[PDB]
Design a protein around this ligand. Structure first.
Ligand SMILES: O=C(O)CCC/C=C\C[C@@H]1[C@@H](/C=C/[C@@H](O)COc2ccc(I)cc2)[C@H]2CC[C@@H]1O2
Ligand SMILES: CC(C)CCC[C@@H](C)[C@H]1CC[C@H]2[C@@H]3CC=C4C[C@@H](O)CC[C@]4(C)[C@H]3CC[C@]12C
Ligand SMILES: CC(C)CCC[C@@H](C)[C@H]1CC[C@H]2[C@@H]3CC=C4C[C@@H](O)CC[C@]4(C)[C@H]3CC[C@]12C
Ligand SMILES: CC(C)CCC[C@@H](C)[C@H]1CC[C@H]2[C@@H]3CC=C4C[C@@H](O)CC[C@]4(C)[C@H]3CC[C@]12C
Ligand SMILES: CC(C)CCC[C@@H](C)[C@H]1CC[C@H]2[C@@H]3CC=C4C[C@@H](O)CC[C@]4(C)[C@H]3CC[C@]12C
Lengths: 338, 232, 308, 227, 54
């Protein structure tokens, strides 16, 4: 019966809320009030990477911490040489509309995708020395928003059809399909162990999914608007989510309840991308205000402003060694802050 | 991948000749070309190099104003014009394709070699002391190559290339940059160095793994090859 | 050579040669150019420079006018106030040559910049289906280089710089000397070509815009607004250029071609000619004062930003 | 200094820059339009997931992008089309019941923050069906739009060559509704060119060409005059 | 009509074990303190050690 199902769902939600309230023994702010805050973290544009002739929509840092990708609206996926700013490669995309760009952990393949609903994996280490579409995964009914390389052969992708798909590059088939989201999924990050991943949806909900089990484990709410980006903590027991409300949030997996919130009351623009430092002390995030704020994850206090761009900021990322904070903006220029 | 060189033959002293080299199976226009000269008795010796797009052209100090290198991307061909050939020019010419970028493998492939017979300062002095190191299959062997200059730029990259030329075959790249192994070669080969002396170590030998080992530097032109060590 | 005496009189000292003209003009020009620079700062900071070539040209013109007014006003005011003199502290007439070059440069750069802006406006209206911010700076540099080269030409033996009445400035000599005639004709022809090209291009732009406006909108999709405001701007520019610049140039030409020669064999000009030259230069000086007023300040948005 | 490999990498980067600039110059001439409408409208049959169509008129090339399948809320993917030259909107003017839904959709697409600088083209479609329906008189617009009862055609407007008074009144009422929704916001940099087209009309792409020319001219004048 | 799947998922989610917030906060503080020394961004490294230094 529909009424019985609704009553059961309401009872389960009430029980979950009561358990979360009971588990809220203390608060992160009170505990961290005894620690010494960092003072006025300032950064400068060490290297500026240009060449793109249209807006930049995505970026990924290579495992080597020296090469990074950038996808534009002009159907160009450029692999740079940040240490020297040389353009290592420039792949002309089949479709000019690309919304994501992922670099393989081994530096062998690069994944791109946008409104085409097709994830194109290009192989870089070709015998002929050229770059070509290694594979083209299809099956999503909506635009592909976020995608990451789980492994050299397994790739997990998120689309606008409210579902996520773990494919197989060798077989080009949907190994697993995860559904349940009531809105478009726009965020996806891979955990350090590459076993669990959190995806945010337009319904202001972040769902944790297991690569093997492939079943939802926890659902985190609290945001008043759509979620645009999510990133894991370096430890792996917590993550952060950014929405259009102009305030970031930090949740803990084990606690299952919201831990921290980050806002200043002087910021009204939405968050486009967030990232974590090597030690996880920082909460670098972007805004439509043409700047990035160095949010303090453990103190929820602003440190500095990387005001260098002229337009919106789309992508933000931090190298594995925590030595580069390269970001990208719609001005068609990347910038490496340090 | 395929590089076929032709045009060689018998040329009298003081004459002119043209050597053609056709490339197929890969983007020729995106790969720079090198002409490697191997004497009947001496080892490999760089002659000329042309970069992608013909923007940069380099010639060996031995041949100046005589050897011209050109490339035709639409025809995917490489032409080497030699004028006023002398006795010393008698040697075998090989085409080598190299692509320069971060993580690349220069001198990945070599040509089959075309013969040519003629009737009748401030350069690295890399020397290979080893001349003959007979061994037995199943054992481990070591080859040492020394350089007169520190082949370690400030960037932290050691510009060394170890090549192997088995009998009846053209030279094949084994190791590039002294650290990364070539593509398709077995993992037995291991390169090590300290900035002045470099060593190749093979844990297990094999019938196919036999020939002449050459050490070359790419720190700065002109390229200089080692004396060459032959196993047995 | 170079320095030459003069017989200024007290009546004309207090009537026509008084320093009040130069001081007031310099102050007004500096204030107007400061307002223009203040507006341009915010305009550039905004980032709305898709067709940034026009804004780059405008910034170049404003900066050129500001620096020229500052330098020449400083020199002239200092000379008039008896802070120094040409014979006393300038045996090295090089100072006069510097003044002549910095006069030609700042009097020829604005015209060429205006012509470039006129071409930009013509292409952006009559052919709206065409087209970096670096080519604009390159063109500005090229125009400045051409002006500087023309100004330096007399140094390497084409023209000649000489003191002019009432002794507070030196400027290209007018006389029968073949090199002087060549330099005068070249200056006049460059000025005339620049102003005429600007006039023709602005006329075509105004005609096309008026045709668009009066062209039946049927439902008047939107109020003409811009299409008339721009028109007005263009019209003003024409006048504020031609009336301000055409007289002096023409005079120069006549003086270098009017037989018998204006300058005496000893090199002394008739008093009437000197007075006319001074008056024409004074009236032409207002082009640089009014350029910021007619290019930025008169704009409705600029005025609103300038309101309390 | 830079080793030989570094110099070769720099040369490769310069070549890549040259190729990119050539491609950009080649691709900058064309103009990108975003085709929007409902299922009832005649989106596809206007000019003689993604579905892009290219057509050239007067030596000017237009790429019309017809993103489809992402119904409901257009957010999270309209951000891509924040630089297009115009949103070709198509609405079936014959259906009175669906007119209010079309007006709501136009309101949503007109006040969107990321589209606060692009001008739509309304392309009131299916003229013949509306004319036949109004001539028949079986369906009354006043049922769903009571204001139309008190509405009279403007006296200064230009009547069609042979349009009847009732058809003209209905057409002008629809156009006025859409234009009024257009002018409630966006004082500058916003226009709602309301062309009125029939099911078959060869002189259709010409309207898009003219309106794109007007949009470009207006933005150029705005840039010239604002500073 | 598919309403049982949501109830089952909610029950499965509610069947997990949750630790106190204080424990998570303490773990996060300990990890941050331990890894602070290994954060070049937190502590500006000398220009010699910065590859992007120019
Ligand atoms: O004894 C005097 O009363 C001035 C006599 C004329 C000499 C110079 C003109 C200057 C004026 C400013 C000039 C600049 O704005 C440059 O203006 C040019 C105009 C025409 C030419 I030909 C070249 C330059 C203003 C400020 C200082 C001077 O009074
Ligand atoms: C309001 C703006 C446009 C005017 C700027 C220029 C004005 C201030 C200039 C132009 C002509 C000048 C006058 C010219 C001549 C004389 C005669 C003598 O008595 C000295 C001052 C006096 C009376 C000057 C005062 C300043 C003056 C009026
Ligand atoms: C940009 C603005 C300030 C204009 C500056 C123009 C400069 C380059 C001009 C102004 C005065 C000029 C100098 C005037 C006189 C002489 C003396 C001559 O024997 C050699 C050239 C020399 C030394 C000129 C060199 C160029 C010069 C310095
Ligand atoms: C007057 C009627 C009959 C004709 C209207 C159409 C054409 C011929 C009109 C419309 C706008 C007009 C121009 C408007 C302004 C000027 C500036 C003036 O200093 C010279 C004439 C000039 C350049 C006009 C030339 C004629 C013109 C192009
Ligand atoms: C709109 C443009 C024309 C600017 C406004 C008019 C300008 C050119 C006017 C305003 C005041 C004028 C000056 C007022 C008085 C004199 C004294 C007279 O013995 C010679 C001319 C001279 C020096 C005038 C030259 C022209 C002048 C500077």
């Amino acid at each position: 019966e529909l009424d019985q199902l609704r009553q059961e769902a309401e009872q389960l939600k009430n029980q979950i809320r009561d358990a979360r309230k009971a588990c809220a023994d203390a608060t992160l702010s009170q505990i961290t009030n005894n620690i010494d805050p960092v003072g006025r973290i300032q950064m400068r544009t060490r290297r500026t990477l240009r060449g793109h002739l249209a807006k930049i929509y995505a970026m990924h840092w290579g495992t080597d911490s020296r090469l990074l990708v950038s996808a534009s609206q002009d159907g160009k996926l450029i692999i740079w040489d940040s240490y020297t700013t040389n353009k290592v490669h420039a792949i002309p995309l089949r479709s000019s509309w690309v919304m994501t760009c992922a670099y393989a952990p081994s530096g062998n393949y690069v994944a791109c995708g946008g409104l085409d609903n097709i994830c194109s994996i290009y192989n870089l280490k070709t015998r002929e020395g050229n770059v070509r579409v290694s594979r083209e995964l299809a099956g999503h009914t909506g635009y592909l928003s976020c995608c990451r390389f789980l492994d050299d052969n397994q790739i997990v992708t998120s689309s606008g059809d409210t579902t996520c798909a773990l494919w197989d590059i060798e077989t080009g088939q949907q190994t697993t399909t995860f559904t349940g989201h009531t809105g478009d999924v726009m965020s996806l990050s891979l955990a350090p162990d590459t076993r669990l991943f959190v995806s945010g949806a337009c319904d202001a909900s972040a769902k944790l999914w297991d690569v093997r089990e492939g079943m939802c484990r926890q659902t985190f709410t609290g945001h008043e608007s759509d979620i645009n980006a999510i990133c894991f903590f370096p430890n792996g027991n917590a993550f952060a989510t950014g929405s259009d409300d102009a305030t970031c949030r930090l949740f803990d997996l084990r606690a299952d309840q919201e831990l921290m919130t980050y806002s200043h009351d002087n910021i009204i623009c939405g968050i486009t991308s967030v990232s974590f430092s090597k030690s996880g002390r920082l909460l670098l995030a972007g805004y439509d205000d043409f700047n990035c704020n160095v949010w303090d994850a453990l103190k929820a206090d602003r440190a500095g402003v990387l005001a260098g761009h002229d337009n919106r900021v789309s992508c933000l990322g931090v190298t594995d060694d925590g030595m580069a904070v390269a970001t990208g903006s719609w001005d068609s220029f990347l910038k490496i802050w340090n | 991948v395929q590089l076929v060189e032709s045009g060689g033959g018998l040329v009298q002293p003081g004459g002119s000749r043209k050597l053609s080299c056709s490339a197929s199976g890969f983007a020729f226009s995106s790969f720079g070309m090198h002409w490697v000269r191997q004497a009947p008795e001496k080892g490999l010796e760089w002659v000329a190099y042309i970069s992608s797009g013909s923007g940069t052209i380099y010639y060996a100090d031995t041949v100046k104003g005589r050897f011209t290198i050109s490339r035709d991307d639409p025809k995917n061909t490489l032409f080497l014009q030699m004028t006023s050939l002398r006795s010393e020019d008698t040697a075998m010419y090989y085409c080598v394709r190299s692509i320069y970028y971060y993580g690349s493998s220069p001198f990945d492939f070599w040509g089959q070699g075309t013969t040519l017979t003629v009737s009748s300062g401030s350069d690295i002095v890399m020397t290979q002391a080893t001349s003959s190191v007979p061994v037995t299959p199943g054992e481990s062997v070591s080859i040492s190559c020394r350089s007169s200059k520190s082949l370690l730029h400030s960037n932290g990259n050691t510009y060394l290339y170890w090549f192997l030329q088995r009998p009846g075959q053209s030279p094949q790249l084994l190791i590039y940059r002294m650290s990364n192994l070539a593509s398709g070669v077995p993992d037995r080969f291991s390169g090590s160095g300290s900035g002045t002396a470099f060593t190749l170590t093979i844990s297990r030998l094999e019938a196919e793994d036999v020939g002449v080992y050459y050490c070359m530097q790419h720190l700065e032109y002109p390229l200089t090859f080692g004396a060459g060590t032959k196993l047995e | 050579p170079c320095f030459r005496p003069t017989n200024i009189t007290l009546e004309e000292r207090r009537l026509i040669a008084s320093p009040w003209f130069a001081a007031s003009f310099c102050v007004v020009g500096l204030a107007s150019n400061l307002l223009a620079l203040s507006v341009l700062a915010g305009a550039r900071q905004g980032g709305s420079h898709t067709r940034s070539s026009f804004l780059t040209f405008l910034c170049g013109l404003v900066l050129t006018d500001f620096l020229g007014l500052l330098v020449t006003g400083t020199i002239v005011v200092s000379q008039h106030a008896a802070l120094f003199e040409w014979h006393a502290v300038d045996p090295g007439c090089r100072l006069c040559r510097f003044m002549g070059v910095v006069m030609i440069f700042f009097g020829l750069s604005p015209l060429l910049l205006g012509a470039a802006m006129a071409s930009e406006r013509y292409l952006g209206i009559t052919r709206p289906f065409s087209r970096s911010q670096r080519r604009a700076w390159a063109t500005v540099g090229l125009v400045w280089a051409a002006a500087l080269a023309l100004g330096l030409l007399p140094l390497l033996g084409v023209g000649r710089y000489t003191v002019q009445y009432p002794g507070s400035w030196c400027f290209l000599t007018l006389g029968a000397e073949s090199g002087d005639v060549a330099f005068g004709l070249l200056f006049s022809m460059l000025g005339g070509l620049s102003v005429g090209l600007s006039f023709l291009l602005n006329t075509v732009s105004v005609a096309t815009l008026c045709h668009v406006y009066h062209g039946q909108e049927a439902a008047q999709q939107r109020p003409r607004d811009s299409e008339v405001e721009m028109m007005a701007q263009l019209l003003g520019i024409m006048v504020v250029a031609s009336v301000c610049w055409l007289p002096l140039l023409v005079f120069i030409a006549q003086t270098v071609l009017r037989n018998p020669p204006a300058m005496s064999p000893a090199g002394q000009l008739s008093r009437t000619t000197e007075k006319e030259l001074l008056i024409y230069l004074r009236v032409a000086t207002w082009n640089q004062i009014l350029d910021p007023w007619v290019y930025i300040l008169f704009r409705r948005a600029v005025l609103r930003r300038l309101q309390p | 200094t830079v080793s030989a490999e570094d110099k070769a990498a720099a040369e490769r980067s310069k070549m890549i820059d040259k190729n990119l600039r050539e491609d950009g110059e080649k691709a900058r001439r064309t103009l990108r339009l975003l085709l929007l409408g409902a299922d009832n409208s005649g989106k596809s049959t206007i000019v003689k997931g993604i579905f892009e169509t290219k057509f050239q008129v007067d030596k000017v090339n237009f790429h019309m992008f017809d993103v489809g399948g992402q119904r409901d809320e257009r957010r999270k993917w309209i951000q891509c089309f924040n630089d297009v030259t115009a949103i070709i909107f198509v609405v079936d003017s014959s259906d009175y019941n669906r007119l209010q839904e079309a007006l709501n959709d136009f309101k949503s697409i007109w006040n969107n923050r990321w589209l606060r600088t692009i001008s739509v083209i309304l392309f009131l479609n299916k003229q013949d069906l509306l004319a036949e329906k109004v001539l028949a008189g079986k369906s009354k617009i006043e049922d769903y739009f009571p204001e139309f009862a008190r509405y009279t055609t403007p006296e200064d407007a230009t009547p069609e060559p042979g349009e009847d008074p009732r058809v003209t009144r209905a057409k002008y009422f629809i156009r006025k509704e859409f234009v009024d929704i257009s002018t409630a916001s966006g004082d500058g940099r916003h226009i709602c060119y309301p062309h009125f087209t029939c099911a078959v009309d060869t002189e259709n792409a010409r309207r898009i060409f003219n309106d794109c020319k007007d949009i470009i001219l207006q933005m150029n004048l705005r840039e010239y005059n604002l500073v | 009509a598919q309403a049982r799947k949501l109830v089952e998922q909610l029950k499965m989610e509610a069947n997990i074990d949750r630790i106190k917030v204080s424990k998570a906060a303490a773990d996060l503080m300990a990890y941050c303190e331990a890894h602070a020394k290994e954060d070049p961004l937190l502590t500006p490294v000398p220009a010699s050690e910065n590859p992007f230094r120019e």
